[PDB]
Symmetry: D2
Amino acid sequence: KCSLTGKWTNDLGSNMTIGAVNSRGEFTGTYTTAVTATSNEIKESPLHGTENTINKRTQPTFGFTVNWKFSESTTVFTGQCFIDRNGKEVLKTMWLLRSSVNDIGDDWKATRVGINIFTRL
Amino acid sequence: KCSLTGKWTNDLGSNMTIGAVNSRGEFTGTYTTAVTATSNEIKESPLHGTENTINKRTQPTFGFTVNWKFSESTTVFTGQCFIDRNGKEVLKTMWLLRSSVNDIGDDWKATRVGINIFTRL
Amino acid sequence: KCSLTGKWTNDLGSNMTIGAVNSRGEFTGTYTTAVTATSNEIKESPLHGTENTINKRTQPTFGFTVNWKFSESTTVFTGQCFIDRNGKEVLKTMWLLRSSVNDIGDDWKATRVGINIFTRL
Amino acid sequence: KCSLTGKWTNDLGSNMTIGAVNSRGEFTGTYTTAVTATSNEIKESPLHGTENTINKRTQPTFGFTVNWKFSESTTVFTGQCFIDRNGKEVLKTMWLLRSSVNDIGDDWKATRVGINIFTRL
Ligand SMILES: O=C(CCCC[C@@H]1SC[C@@H]2NC(=O)N[C@@H]21)NCCc1cc([N+](=O)[O-])ccc1O
Ligand SMILES: O=C(CCCC[C@@H]1SC[C@@H]2NC(=O)N[C@@H]21)NCCc1cc([N+](=O)[O-])ccc1O
Ligand SMILES: O=C(CCCC[C@@H]1SC[C@@H]2NC(=O)N[C@@H]21)NCCc1cc([N+](=O)[O-])ccc1O
Ligand SMILES: O=C(CCCC[C@@H]1SC[C@@H]2NC(=O)N[C@@H]21)NCCc1cc([N+](=O)[O-])ccc1O
């Protein structure tokens, strides 16, 4: 089984730690990004999410939200916990980074998208 | 101030209910989608997320994860709570829908993207 | 059937003109955005794209690239030419807006995503 | 300087060839995907795009459309031509894959998103 609990690092150098996943699939953790678009000092930020439990897949999908403590922005990640060919666990994720814009008319420029691959620390 | 607590409906006809947002911005709720890509019967599904409180913004960002209970997939939403120039609250969101695929080699086709506009129900 | 040739306007107030679509599905046009994230004056910009011709569908898929001439960025749009329930032609599109970054290490923050709905102008 | 002309391969094993880029930044080429979600045999397919000419940047942004000849779908790619830290040319791209859906009510599920990294072949 691929499990979200534990420490992870991604291709940008960011780290996150995820606690126990409960029977409903709920989990919390903390996220330390290695990169930022703000001029502010990066601070560890909480994450909250769920892993899908339907049919108790060995490679479950999941999502979580990172509530940045140094920015008005929010990031959500979603992806799947895979067991790779070599037996290593790998999280394949895509994310949306939501900017705070001043007016509803600026909404069009508020959402960035990208990938991250996570492996255990 | 734009508050996430309450009942909302979006442009596809889906509804969600969001509970109280605590002092750390955390909230939970339930989501009833009007549409699905599965043949399975739609079931009410839990959501978990956070709204960003940095700088007491009247129009905060947020994200949440919907842990579908009739599918092995997961959706994450992120967006901003706006006060329309009329004065009504509107959630402008973008989402990622992560399908479950059998093999890590099929990861490339597993993520859909889209928009939803929510207003109070 | 839904056809791409003509003048269109979208939900942001932007306009585009699409020329003749040749037998290979190729087309060119010009794009005048109503909105920008730069400080530079908006300039009309050329677009180039293709319409899918497989099975000669009445509601074809398409894509095009807008080569901005007041910015170092690039936008691609992709979507489908629909005949809506009311009989009106509508382009449902999503886009990626690629910013120029100075360093490959900053690639993660360079891609924005969004939607546009077009109707004939 | 990073130029799009030449033969490339990406992380999924797909190949593409791009011809000369003219003074307006326009180019065409062909694309052989290594993967498909259809049950049709993959066929080499044309691509059409532009690279951004503003400020004649060493690492220009670009976009292009792939007009699949074995599917009713369309993919658009956008990204930046980087000189990476090994002095090698790398295309860092993100894409939108637009499915053909029968009805405008199905539009919400028609767009997939992902990444590709291309290096010279
Ligand atoms: O840095 C941040 C927040 C941390 C994001 C880290 C990402 S999450 C995806 C990826 N994966 C990973 O591990 N790290 C990165 N910027 C957003 C705020 C912001 C600032 C400005 N501005 O300063 O002008 C403008 C617009 C804006 O939206
Ligand atoms: O349908 C769902 C769950 C509900 C998603 C509702 C969305 S969330 C964004 C939008 N907003 C909103 O309100 N509703 C919609 N998952 C699809 C899984 C799946 C199944 C198959 N399969 O049938 O095997 C094939 C491919 C697949 O991707
Ligand atoms: O603004 C543009 C060109 C016009 C794009 C219009 C969009 S295309 C999708 C949507 N639909 C539509 O009709 N109009 C909009 N590029 C921004 C590049 C950029 C510049 C800076 N900067 O240097 O300040 C910072 C961050 C950046 O991302
Ligand atoms: O498989 C294709 C064409 C080849 C795309 C290859 C991609 S492009 C991004 C990535 N990078 C790369 O090199 N190869 C891959 N289209 C299927 C999508 C689809 C279409 C419909 N439909 O149109 O009805 C219905 C259901 C569907 O799932």
